[PDB]
Design a protein around this ligand. Structure first.
Ligand code: HEM
Ligand code: HEM
Ligand SMILES: CN(C)Cc1ccc(OCc2ccc3ccc(N)nc3c2)cc1
Ligand SMILES: CN(C)Cc1ccc(OCc2ccc3ccc(N)nc3c2)cc1
Ligand SMILES: CN(C)Cc1ccc(OCc2ccc3ccc(N)nc3c2)cc1
Ligand SMILES: CN(C)Cc1ccc(OCc2ccc3ccc(N)nc3c2)cc1
Ligand SMILES: [Cl-]
Ligand SMILES: [Cl-]
Lengths: 362, 362
């Protein structure tokens, strides 16, 4: 039953993986070994090669990601060996350091031991490893509203934030067998942040905006050949609109457009003036400029879509079906200036892939 | 068989229409009459009230339209009585005059005789009643590329364009029984155009851009209670991004962004400068300003989305299911600054509705 689903997923994954790796003759024997391993044990263990290629295929199959051209250069760190909360903490710290790479960001995934019988070995509570706290109480809003529930959960466990708009949340995760997660403050030497300034409007720094360098998404499940890696944080580099059109602009996030409009010297009074649009463009210019000036990797949405076009072409050339989610692939600014807007995409789900999972708080 | 489909569509339409009109008691007798009419004749004829309410319901059910708040104020002109090409031409001329309304645009639909047995009585070739010609030959591109095939078809029939970038196509339509369509030049007194200028950048007029006042879509089919009105042109007023983000900006349309960038004084050299985005915002500001200054109705995408929010609320309050196509409802600039971007919509098709139909040329 469980063995059944597993073996089926396994046969399909190994066949495809080994084919792509030019190891097609090795499949029969590898499947034999896996078959006996499942019978005796209830599951099977991926070789380092399978796990590496599987994580890369999962990125390649992520319909919502515009950054997939670079799927084959993912840096895969195998941490299936950790057993203690100090090892997990140090692996997470290491991921941050090695992914950051002094600003020349390396797309990286660190893979922790998989669920055994749907039992998690490690359960990471963070949405991203580096993220700002948010607070709301009696009229007063501080920080990132999207972090309010995790922030409140951390404070239940004895963490206390300084209540700036940019407090770094601690790493917070739970080990199998523990009733409660543990938390660890991030060493500030590990976390690059970028102050937001504008290439020609000097007043822009009056907003005192900043953002962190590396988005390291840490609450998705990697599924490969029927094995469920629920703890497997990964990162790329940012596309500037994630920061400038969404994290800093959304009304339910930092909500900065009215403030941007004021410092760039335009009125925010009439919809027909398109002041929100103009503010969005200047904010997004500032974000790109600031990351580039600091030597931290970032891509703008035009260049990203041009890369995605080459991914579509590479898929066709490899004879691989392309899958995509148009509603996530279009950028939130000037979407019709990208080729993505003017075509359609098949939203089928192909495995290996990354998946949402239930949050352990709220 | 044909009578079958028709009667079914009829029962459903009359029931819903009469319910909305508070005429629910009248349904049984009206359906009786329709039943006998279908038997004897092969179809049935809508009352003026049914046709009016049906056209309004079709707009209300148009998933891709952000302008639906105003569905109930559609001005319905019943031209089921025309029989000659001179009557059709004059009805089309009248629609333009009455919809334009000296710039205070009235959403209007003119309804011509329906298909009888899938046989069209009138077949309009224009995509819109007012639209610019386009030409391409030996490297040279003039006018609106989206009009190249209709333009070439018109010139086959002895029309000749002046080959400016803004030649008005003639009305072109075919009457049942004629092998060929006829064409008629538009009287220039009927067609309002708006020169595009910028509220603060004086050089913008050097681009010599203009657009026409009223989008009058004339190649869709209105289907109401199983009756197929294949000729039923309608108009609203423009949302500024249709002109500024698409007709004048798309690379396969007028392709003006590099030219806009030059006149607003920014370089068009680096993607990270977001010059296309900045040019798009200034072009779209200019379009709104120019229409407002000339006294021609137009709506900006923020105000339009705010109106659409009130449509969603009115639907809920009326106990009507809302349907929508997210990919067409989001505006092509700053989509994430509208509420539309942050929700999903059910793309089910409900009738009455407007439908694509095959073009009679190409
Ligand atoms: C290298 C630079 C990368 C860029 C610039 C990039 C860009 C993006 C963007 C802009 C999104 C949409 C985010 C949103 O709208 O919330 C996204 C989604 C995604 N990316 Fe990438 N990405 C990159 C690398 C990666 C890597 C390394 C992985 C995994 C190995 C990954 C997996 C995904 C997934 C799973 C999603 C969808 C998440 C969801 O469903 O919520 N990306 N990417
Ligand atoms: C009153 C002002 C109106 C505004 C501002 C408006 C706005 C728009 C916009 C922006 C589009 C998308 C166009 C595109 O992306 O190509 C659209 C689609 C549409 N509108 Fe409206 N509209 C209005 C009135 C009307 C009226 C009066 C009707 C019919 C009675 C109508 C029927 C539709 C239909 C059928 C579509 C989709 C066409 C397709 O599938 O290609 N609209 N509308
Ligand atoms: C838990 N869900 C309700 C929210 C959720 C939202 C975005 C998520 O990831 C977005 C995402 C994922 C990977 C990325 C890689 C690089 C990049 N620049 N952005 C990226 C953005 C994951 C979960
Ligand atoms: C597989 N293709 C041949 C079919 C196909 C291509 C693009 C498609 O749409 C792209 C698209 C998406 C959103 C739009 C919103 C407005 C608009 N005027 N066109 C829009 C066009 C649809 C189908
Ligand atoms: C024949 N199809 C391939 C293309 C096609 C594209 C847009 C069409 O209508 C778009 C449309 C329809 C009604 C409108 C009413 C008002 C407005 N501002 N734009 C509007 C825009 C109809 C057909
Ligand atoms: C019926 N609702 C409760 C479910 C529902 C609401 C909004 C949904 O998505 C809106 C939406 C569309 C496109 C997006 C692109 C990127 C992004 N980060 N979020 C995006 C969010 C999806 C489901
Ligand atoms: Cl983010
Ligand atoms: Cl148009």
């Amino acid at each position: 039953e469980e063995k059944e689903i597993l073996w089926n997923e396994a046969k399909a994954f190994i066949a495809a993986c080994y084919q792509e790796l030019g190891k097609a003759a090795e499949v029969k024997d590898r499947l034999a070994d896996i078959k006996s391993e499942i019978d005796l044990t209830g599951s099977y263990v991926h070789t380092k090669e399978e796990l590496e290629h599987g994580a890369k295929m999962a990125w390649r199959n992520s319909n919502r990601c515009i950054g997939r051209l670079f799927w084959n250069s993912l840096n895969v760190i195998d941490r299936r060996d950790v057993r203690t909360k100090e090892e997990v903490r140090d692996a997470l710290f290491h991921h941050i350091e090695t992914a950051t790479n002094n600003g020349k960001i390396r797309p990286t995934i660190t893979i922790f031991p998989p669920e055994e019988k749907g039992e998690k070995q490690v359960e990471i509570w963070n949405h991203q490893l580096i993220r700002y706290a948010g607070y709301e109480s009696d009229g007063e809003r501080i920080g990132d509203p999207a972090s309010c529930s995790l922030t409140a959960a951390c404070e239940e466990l004895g963490w206390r934030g300084e209540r700036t708009d940019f407090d770094l949340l601690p790493l917070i995760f739970r080990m199998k067998g523990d009733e409660q997660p543990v938390w660890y403050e991030l060493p500030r030497s590990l976390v690059i942040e970028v102050p937001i300034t504008h290439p020609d409007i000097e007043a822009f720094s009056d907003l005192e905006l900043k953002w962190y360098g590396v988005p390291i998404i840490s609450d998705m499940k990697l599924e490969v050949g029927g094995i469920h890696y629920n703890a497997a944080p990964f990162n790329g580099w940012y596309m500037g609109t994630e920061i400038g059109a969404r994290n800093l602009a959304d009304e339910k996030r930092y909500d900065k457009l009215k403030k941007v409009a004021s410092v760039i010297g335009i009125a925010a009074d009439y919809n027909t003036d398109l002041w929100k649009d103009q503010a969005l463009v200047e904010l997004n210019k500032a974000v790109l400029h600031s990351y580039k000036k600091q030597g931290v990797s970032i891509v703008d949405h035009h260049t990203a879509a041009s890369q995605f076009k080459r991914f579509e072409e590479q898929a066709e050339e490899a004879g691989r079906k392309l899958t995509g989610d148009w509603t996530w692939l279009i950028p939130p600014i000037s979407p019709a200036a990208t080729h993505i807007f003017h075509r359609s995409y098949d939203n089928s789900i192909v495995k290996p892939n990354y998946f949402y999972q239930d949050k352990p708080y709220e």
